Subunit: 134 residues, 4 copies
């Protein structure tokens, strides 16, 4: 699926966010997501060896705090003009479990594409969220 105007806006928002702060090894990626009501949420990562969140997960916390229950699209943007970063595996899993069908923006052959997170986890592990077990 090709990048929409809304997707380009997410790229632009996340780029503005990461470029708005000093270059840091700890806070090096911004993410923005849009809700089904059209609100945009953004954040930056927190790098730490105990599993500090990616930018996408910070965005999930910001959206939750705003009561935006349904997120439809999300992108991650690297610092220093480095562009789109695909979601890492952890981000894919958390997004598939908590926001099924959310589309992540990634680099593609003819231009950026918008890919449902489940397609980013072929042969998926689907957490049964009703239980505190794997």
């Amino acid at each position: 699926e090709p990048l929409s105007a809304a997707g380009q806006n997410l790229i632009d928002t996340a780029t503005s966010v990461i470029n708005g702060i000093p270059v840091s090894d700890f806070y090096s990626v911004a993410s923005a997501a849009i809700s089904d009501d059209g609100r945009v949420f953004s954040g930056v990562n927190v790098y730490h060896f105990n599993g500090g969140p990616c930018a996408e997960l910070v965005v999930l916390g910001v959206a939750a705090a705003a009561g935006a229950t349904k997120l439809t699209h999300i992108v991650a943007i690297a610092n220093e003009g480095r562009g789109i970063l695909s979601p890492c595996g952890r981000c894919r899993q958390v997004l598939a479990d908590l926001h099924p069908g959310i589309k992540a923006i990634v680099i593609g052959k003819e231009g950026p594409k918008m890919v449902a997170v489940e397609e980013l986890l072929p042969s998926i592990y689907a957490w049964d969220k009703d239980y505190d077990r794997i």
Copy 2:
């Protein structure tokens, strides 16, 4: 150290945030922190078995996105009208490593107290942040 006026405001802010969203197993705690220039940032947790961030780590990402490099105080508040939660061990580590000397607000004998995160990790492990190693 007894709770300060700014500390009470962080409690009030986090309380307002968590009680402003539907009760959820997954988005169940809010956090608020203040910067050295008086800016207050908030967020909610994202529970997930792959290590979804606590509310405190969402706040760190929000604060970083705003360019607030120095955070001085932080609190976490439970849902359903329910009050202060001390930081978990992971939050203590991340806070100690990334925001040295930040005070966490916790329950105390005469009222809430504000404790330097390092005092919440006796016999501390200090990450040498210059390296991708423990």
Copy 3:
């Protein structure tokens, strides 16, 4: 890739592990991996809200402790006869970053198949 004799031996090992221990509130999956020296390492998950490791990550730590530099295959077997579990997304990332080309054993149409971890992360994010 169809399941190999080595992959079946790995499934036997992981199944033996999870079926050999009691029920717990904190674990539910065993994993086993193969090294390019023919070594096999196993472990069970550690469930915790701060990101306790999956079984596969425990296995990586056991491999590392043994000085085992290259792992070629891995599988995760759930308790209660639930069978093979595909790696979760975090496991895929760690495996791709630390053990490029490792094959995860997953369930496909004709039974278990073995799939390079990179194929389990289309449009991959590579840690620099």
Copy 4:
């Protein structure tokens, strides 16, 4: 009060030391851990450094112990590579240990030799993970 290092404690230091010394110096695998169960078996492992929260050595040990059917761990230590010696558990490890192995004693440095400290004492104003439905 902290207990002085026991013979079993020293055997864990020796185990972790032999483990970490027996492998190539690496930034990804830089710490070994060893723990002893009530049934007297010793379990060991090395950390897996990764930005998605790859486990510390202690967490690997918990998985090793569980796979072996050893449900009760009483003492644990972490030994760093390059003769760097005892590392105290990080904040995440303290939380996981307290929640999963209450009363386990961590071996940490002391002014008069190493001491063995109940992990709850390493988390003043402790956060306890509480849910019967899940």
